[PDB]
Amino acid sequence: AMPFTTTALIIGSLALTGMPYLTGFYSKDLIIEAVNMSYTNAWALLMTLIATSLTAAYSTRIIFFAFLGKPRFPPLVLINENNPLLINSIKRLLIGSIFAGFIISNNIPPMTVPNTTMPLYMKMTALIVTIMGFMLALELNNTTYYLKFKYPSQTYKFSNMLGYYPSIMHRLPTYHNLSMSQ
Amino acid sequence: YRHSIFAVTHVLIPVWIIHYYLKYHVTAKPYTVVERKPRIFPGDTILETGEVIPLMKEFPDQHH
Amino acid sequence: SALLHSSTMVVAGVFLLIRFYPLMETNKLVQTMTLCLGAITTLFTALCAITQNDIKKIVA
Amino acid sequence: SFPKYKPSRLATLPATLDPAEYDISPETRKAQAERLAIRSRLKREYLLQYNDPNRLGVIEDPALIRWTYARSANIYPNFRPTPKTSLLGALFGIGPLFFWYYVFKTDRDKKEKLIQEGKLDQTFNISY
Amino acid sequence: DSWDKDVYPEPPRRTPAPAPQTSLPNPVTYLTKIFDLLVDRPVTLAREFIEQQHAKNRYYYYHREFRRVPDITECEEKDILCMFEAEMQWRRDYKVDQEIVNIIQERLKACQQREGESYRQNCAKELEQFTQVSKAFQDRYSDLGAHYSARKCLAKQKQRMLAERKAAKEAAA
Amino acid sequence: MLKIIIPTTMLLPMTWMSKHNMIWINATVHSLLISLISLSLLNQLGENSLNFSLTFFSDSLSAPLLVLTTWLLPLMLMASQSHLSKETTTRKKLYITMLILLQLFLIMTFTATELILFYILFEATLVPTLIIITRWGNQTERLNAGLYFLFYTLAGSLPLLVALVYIQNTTGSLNFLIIHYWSHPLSNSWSNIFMWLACIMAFMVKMPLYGLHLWLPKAHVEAPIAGSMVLAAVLLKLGGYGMMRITTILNPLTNYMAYPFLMLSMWGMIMTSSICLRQTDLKSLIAYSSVSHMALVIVAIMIQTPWSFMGATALMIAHGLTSSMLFCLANTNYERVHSRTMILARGLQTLLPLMATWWLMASLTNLALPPSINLIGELFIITASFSWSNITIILMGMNMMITALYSLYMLITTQRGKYTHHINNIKASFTRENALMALHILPLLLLTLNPKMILGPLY
Amino acid sequence: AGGGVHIEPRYRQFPQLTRSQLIQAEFFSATMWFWILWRFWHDSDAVLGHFPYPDPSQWTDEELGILPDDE
Amino acid sequence: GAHLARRYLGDASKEPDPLRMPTFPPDYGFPERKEREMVATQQEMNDAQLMLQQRDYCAHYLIQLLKCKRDSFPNFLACKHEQHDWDYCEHLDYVKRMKEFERERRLLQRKKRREQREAEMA
Amino acid sequence: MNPFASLTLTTLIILTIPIMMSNSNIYKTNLYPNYVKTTVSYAFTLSLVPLLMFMHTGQEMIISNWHWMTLQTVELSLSFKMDYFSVMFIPVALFVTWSIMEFSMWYMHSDPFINRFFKYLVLFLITMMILVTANNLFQLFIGWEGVGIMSFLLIGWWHGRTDANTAALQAILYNRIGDIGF
Amino acid sequence: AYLTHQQKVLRLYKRALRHLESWCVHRDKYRYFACLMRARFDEHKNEKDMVKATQLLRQAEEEFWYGQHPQPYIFPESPGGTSYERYECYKVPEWCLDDWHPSEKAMYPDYFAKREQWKRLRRESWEREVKQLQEETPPGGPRTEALPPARKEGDLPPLWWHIVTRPRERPM
Amino acid sequence: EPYPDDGMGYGDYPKLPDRSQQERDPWYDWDHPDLRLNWGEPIHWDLDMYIRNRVDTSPTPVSWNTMCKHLSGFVAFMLFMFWVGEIYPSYQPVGPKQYPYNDLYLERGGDPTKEPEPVVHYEI
Amino acid sequence: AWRYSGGFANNVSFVGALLKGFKWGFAAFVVAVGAEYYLESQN
């Protein structure tokens, strides 16, 4: 229904993952390779690896629900992206995602310590965790297609209301400080 | 024409007065516009002293 | 949000450390806290990212 | 199944599981019946001035004026000195003031004794 | 320019010789060349016309000197007139010494940017120069209070050799 | 001076014998003209204070206040001339007489060379203000408010009078010059302790300091607008001018004794701004806001370091021009709705578009963004206070965080919201109001370019 | 009032699609792959790990300078 | 690497602690180990504005890299052979490090199994 | 001292021109958004030039100008620092803000205060530019507070939305806690 | 007023169905689970004892309250919705137009002239609305929040000005 | 019923239940829709705290005590083994950077007069 | 009904959408690698 907008979304989502030789690769998995080859805080390293895999997870949710499925919007469809301003704006940025990762990396002077000699197994973990994240997130998202009755998991609850953060943060000290004020 | 007059009254005349500001006004004051020295390499001569910088000696043929 | 809260205003925080990077390396305790803070921030925001039902929240 | 939703001063109990609407007697219906009536008198009155073309002024809410009085002037004349108020005055008042006094004085004594011996060095600190 | 290198030492530049082996043209030459012929040249033309217009009617200005006056170390106690002459001179000496630190700070800041990456060791002479200025300025003016006066400055000064006399006498043993 | 004091005095017979309706015109003409003349004193020489006569002299601290007071005089005229246009000619003439007289005392006080002459006129400002708050006030609590303001200021000022004459008998002359060049070490002793307390309490009450401040929420709120400015925009700084001059002799006893005042101001400023977080009267909101800013000046004076004195004057001038602005803002609504409750008139940007913009920069100046003079003052004190003690940045910044919430709070509650349904008498803002607001904020943002003029006597 | 709507609304039906959006989407969705394989062919070593990691165990004590247990 | 598991879960004695290694004299047991040298002399090394963390022994494989990168501008796709040379040379000094890391590792159980060896029979 | 000094500094001056032009009302009220976009586009293409001497010459600038105050022994004055992080961030920021400004025309084609909205965006860009181009910590604070307040208005752009002010209040609240360390 | 049981159970059905919308997502899954939800409601419909009905409600409300989606789907043009009062900041009241300058007043002669007709119509009918109220007030003040209509001809409905002349939901 | 007579000066002001304006029926007609408030209804003593853009007491789906237990658990759970990551840091089978010219003492801000003790690296 | 019937039927799979444009992307490679081979043979 929205070819160019969907096309741009896939490009942007893939950049979030860091597909090789694309804009995402020239920064992100270079960091993950860099963070592996360092004296890090052990538990700090693991969380990023869980995080970068988690980057693909919500990325599927965007592509899965919004595009890959049957329509669910109100009946009167007003889908339209033919406006030149919309096309030109996305087009200008979209070429910046296909390129400018190679362009900047080559153009900038080489001035960082290069991690050249790593054992193979952690060299491409960024591709593993994303593909692993891609595979299971798709299966779990497609599990919604199954007619099975849903059971509200308490872990899902913790994630959905933002780690219970807003209702303690944005309710308790605000009340206490304002209560002390009056 | 709209683009041409735009360049004159938004690109030409602004950089004109900044150039005057950054060529005679501030430049008459020391240590107001300072840059890192042009990073030179052994090899190419320096324009002012006219002396080729002594190039390094042999590398131990560390070819792939 | 597409301009400010995506790539041009929230960048200020990380950019500040980039300006003071030469003074960053001398200390060892604080720089560990930076990678420590980034680690928890990555998971918790991503952990709350997946289970959201609004397109704007997911990108945020 | 899943044990119940205990409330809190910040997370109040919703009306969808409150026993009040799930156990009702005729007396409760009688009391809540004309709750609209007392609100209707307020609403019908307020609508009458609001929709009045001749009304070219602001409509004063006596509840709102009462609230400003209750928060500003009707406090000290209604204040009664009691140990609860007396202790809270000291605990929220002179208490923290001495607390900061002890913290700052100790730091100043710490700082003053240290540079006297020669511990802290401000070879580059000049402006102060 | 409008100053001397002895006050603002700027080491002579070291510019390389651009010799691009690659056949494709260097664009940065082209934008620089068009910049000179489209912006820089009219700016210079206006400037020289401005400079000669100034040169037609030359009005001069000189610089104010303050002859040395007796300071507060020889000022008699309760001598209000010599109190004022000494106090004003000391505060004038305060302002110039403040500018002395100001100059050294500018040189140190120039030391950083000019060396770029090599700021740490190339001009450590600037760092020790500021170390001497800042340390001496500390015992000279620092901690004098918002109501600093030449009497207070002697009071802080007198504390130094008095402590120094005790130390050296202890050191001599 | 004589060159500003005499024109100020000569405005008094001019306004009295002026034309029936031209009183507001002519008084505004020359009061602006006199302010232009007072711009001449903004220049200061190298270190010696600008001295004209034996009784009058100026320095790099009095002159920035002198221009502020004389520049203020036109502003009270236009702001008050809205409601004053509905009474007798003599009554209106009596008001302009009283503002002219009140300003006259302020100009002569700030340039006073003898400390006794300073005290006489410093306390003499009570009479023009006291009658302003009482006679022309628009409430009932003004009667109690006027008594609170008069008695608090006088109860502290009287020990100063006894203390001041004591210096005269013991040390000799009390000229601000001879005091400075003949400063003697005030050694720690119980008699000197009360000497220190007497010479300080008088100026502390008029700051006001946390605890000796309950006169401000009563005086400022109940006062008429022509007054509501000066009790917040100039004469609070008059207590400030007293501190920075009288502390010339109070060394080194000040650092040993300053601790109760520092803790009271440094901790109370969090509490005072906490009142602003939950308030019901817009005038009271700004009033308690002034206490927090002045409390920051209170701590600033007592470190007695070059940076603190600069940030003291910078905030002192900037807050006065700011707090005067907000009182104009609250005045405009209070005339249209005839009430001071905040929630009554929610929604003004929808109806008054530029009033929101003026409210935006007004609440922004109090928010003290860089490089606004409010920020250039508070930031200087924070660095000076931090050098004194590292812990104080917890308290100093906490207000800076807290002050953001309430300073934008009336912006949200009044401007940013649905317009109140029942109110129907809001009118398009008169060009007097907008012109007055520009007269407040344009010098403030213009002053940002050259803070050296207002930076104090230690630049 | 006036026109200017190249598209038209659809009720419970596939919305009208024009030429410009379709091949514009196809071009960039295809050239993204063109970049993917072209750079892969030229620079497969970057993702592969061009430089091998030697196995520590195979390094014998001789070039390691490890004098044997007899001493 | 896998040594981390053998250091924490396993006995940490057998495994080095990169904070303080080397501990025993590296020259001990090494017959005339060859002294490292660098062609890039310091003043030109400082001239190149070369970052401290990039000032290793193989840092002279940058000076030509920047030189070609400077001169070959605007061609950025060029300067690949010498760039690969630097990375390959970054390989060499890097593999040098796990040689001494392994040597420290291998001398660890060497000394330790000796410690109970010449002490158990007595 | 090449054009890299003057030309890179005028980029900000091009950006602030629409802000001054707004109050004079000489701008045609219909085509103000077009005025803003092509102005940023001109600044963007002008901001490309600082890049070319960055890879070619490898030079960086520090531009100090008019003295603010000679406060004691410090020389607080306006000053800018061109460097690796700066000379490329503005081209990226300008390219991004140009693309969205073109997009903003199509999306916000019905807001009656559209001229005001584009005015806010330029002001944010000016505050962000001086944030990334700052030599003294005080100038860094100018942007550090300029972007924060600019976010507050822009978040509460829809004004009457009751919860929008809460987020607007939230944005400044969390920012002020951040400014504690600053 | 007093919300009777048959209304409250309908409120549960409407709200619970909207909640499983946030759960079921896919339309075919919705239509299946809705039918089970629908018929499972109708299976117990012969309870002559009203107490048992509340007893059936004694577990349903908690069933809803723990099975509710933590991020339920609400349409934007509603409380909690993303577009709630989004366009409110343009709802300028119509009485503000009386303060327009004559130059702007003359800019739209037709609308302003018709505004005068409405203002004159409101002025004439106001007192007509007023006596209509006390002609049929319930003994003891207004009992219900409802508002009686215009009983006779030539009379506008009582208290009609604000409802009729309210700003449009899409003012722009 | 008025507030408890703690002597706090509340007076006879009604003790309305501590319920924020967020807990109002939006579809019900409100004379002050931005506050969901009618006319003359005695407003809460702390209205300026429970107002729409402030502290809201709307019921969260999950219980407040469980809300605290999970949040307080998570931060402590995550922080506690952030520390155990530090006591067991992750490093690679590689020694320290063998740096030239005695750890670049001259270039590392060292005193030229103070000759650095010989730090030289060899082949391995 | 319409949410499944009509043109809204036969929606591509997740992975299938990921390789959108690969049908022509591989063809772009073939002609590109052919030019590289021709340039390689030319040298």
Ligand SMILES: CCCCCCCCCCCCCCCCCC(=O)O[C@@H](COC(=O)CCCCCCCCCCCCCCC)COP(=O)(O)OC[C@H](O)CO
């Ligand atoms: C409303 C209550 C007071 C509010 C706060 C006011 C400020 C607090 C301090 C109060 C005392 C102010 C009066 C100070 C007088 C001048 C102080 C001075 O210069 O110091 C003298 C010290 O001043 C005093 O001795 C008097 C002041 C101390 C307090 C005693 C009197 C004041 C308290 C009671 C009256 C005021 C309280 C209100 C009563 C209703 C030095 O003289 P000396 O004692 O060294 O004399 C020479 C020789 O040694 C012996 O004389």
